[PDB]
Homo-oligomer: A and B are copies of this chain.
Amino acid sequence: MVTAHFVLIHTICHGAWIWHKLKPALERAGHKVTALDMAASGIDPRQIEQINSFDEYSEPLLTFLEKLPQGEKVIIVGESCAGLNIAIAADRYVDKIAAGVFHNSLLPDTVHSPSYTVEKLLESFPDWRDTEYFTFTNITGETITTMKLGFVLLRENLFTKCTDGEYELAKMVMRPGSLFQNVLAQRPKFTEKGYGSIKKVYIWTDQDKIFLPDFQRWQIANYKPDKVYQVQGGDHKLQLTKTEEVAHILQEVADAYA
C-alpha cells in the first residue's frame, strides 16, 4: 500500500469544510492531506466580485502547487465543478500531478471549449430551484453570473442522503459562487501536453440527484477515463455519505498512480 499526498478541492460555493470527514479518513491510512479553500470560498477572505475568471478562482490551488517541493506529486480530487480546477492546474503543473480524481464532477476534454461540460450540465439539469442569481461586472466588462444555492436544492439535490447535521453545516457556511461560464467559453481549450496527459479516475453514483446518470454516462463516453468506479447508493456528496468507500477508492488510486 502506497501512501500519497491528496489535494482536495471543493466545488463553487462550498469550501474546504465539505471534506471535513474524508480528510481524517485518508490520514488514518497514513496519507498526507491538503484541503484548500478556493478564492471567495470557505474562509478565504476574498468576495466573488473581486474574482474575474475561473483561473483566478483557482489561485489557491496553483499557488499551492508552485510551492510544492520538487519530485513531489499530488493526487488532486475535485467534486462537481472542481473538475475545471483540475484541468486549469494540469495545464500549469503537469509535472506535479500523479492523477486527477473526478468526484461526481465535471470532466472537461481538450477537443471542445472549456465551457463545454458546463453547457451539457445545464442542459441535463436546467432548473436550479430556489437558487438565486446576481451579476457584477468583471475587470474587462464581462457580466459574471453569481449564485446563492437554494436551501431546497441543497437539501434534495446535493445533500439528498446526508445527515441533518451535515445539511445544517452546509447552510451555515455556503457562500456565493460562479461558473464564469461565458469567460470559460472564450478561454483557450485545455491542452493535450498538460491536462490531456494526466491520469484521470472518475468516481460516481447513479443515485446523484444533481449530476444525473444520463449526464454522467455521457461524460464517461465523451472522454474515456483511465478508471471508472461506481459507488452504490449514497448521494452527490459521496465524501459525506460514502466516506470510507471513497477512502478505499482513493487508496486504489494511490496504489495505481503513486
Point out residues on A near B: beta carbons under 8 Å.
Answer: 15-17, 19-21, 23-24, 35, 42-43, 45, 47, 164-169, 172-175
Contact = CB atoms under 8 A, between A and B. Distances in A.
A17 B164 CA distance: 13
Contacts of A166: 20
B172 A24 contact: no
Contacts of A35: 172
Number of chain copies forming the complex: 2
A173 B166 CA distance: 14
A17 B43 CA distance: 12
Contact of A23 (B47, B168, B174): B168
B45 A172 contact: no
A180 to B, nearest CB: 20
Most buried by B among A35, A45, A165, A175: A165
Nearest to A18: B172
Contacts of A15: 172-173
Contacts of A173: 15-17, 42-43, 173
A31 to B, nearest CB: 14
B47 A169 contact: no
A166 B174 CA distance: 17
24 contacts: A15-B173, A16-B172, A17-B17, A17-B173, A19-B172, A20-B165, A20-B166, A20-B168, A20-B169, A20-B172, A21-B168, A23-B168, A24-B164, A24-B165, A24-B167, A35-B172, A43-B43, A43-B172, A43-B173, A43-B174, A43-B175, A45-B47, A169-B169, A173-B173
Contacts of A43: 43, 172-175
A172 B47 CA distance: 18
Given A15-B172, A35-B172, A165 B42 contact: no
A21 B164 CA distance: 8
What are the nearest 10 A-B pairs in CB distance?
A24-B164, A20-B169, A17-B172, A21-B165, A16-B172, A20-B168, A24-B168, A23-B168, A20-B165, A17-B173
Contacts of A23: 168
Contacts of A169: 17, 20, 169
A49 B169 CA distance: 26
A20 to B, nearest CB: 4
